[PDB]
Amino acid sequence: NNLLRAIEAQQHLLQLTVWGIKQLQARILAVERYLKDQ
Amino acid sequence: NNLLRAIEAQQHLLQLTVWGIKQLQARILAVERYLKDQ
């Protein structure tokens, strides 16, 4: 039961790291485009 | 016991991916600010 609880909490951590990677991919793409456009 | 060992090692991987996401969030924010300031 401790291992099931650990995997459930680890899944929540993975969802948070996916949210953060998608935020950073959109922000670096924005900056790339801004520099290309300049 | 193999599954406990797997979850322990996966937790170490997740900590490494959190370190890397926080490094990249600070570096893209720095670049955003630099461009705003220019």
Partner: peptide
Amino acid sequence: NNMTWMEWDREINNYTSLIHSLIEE
């Protein structure tokens, strides 16, 4: 969503502390 980086940090820390206890126990 409403998510901010300060909230993201708090939630990472909360889930990491929990997993540590579950794994030790």
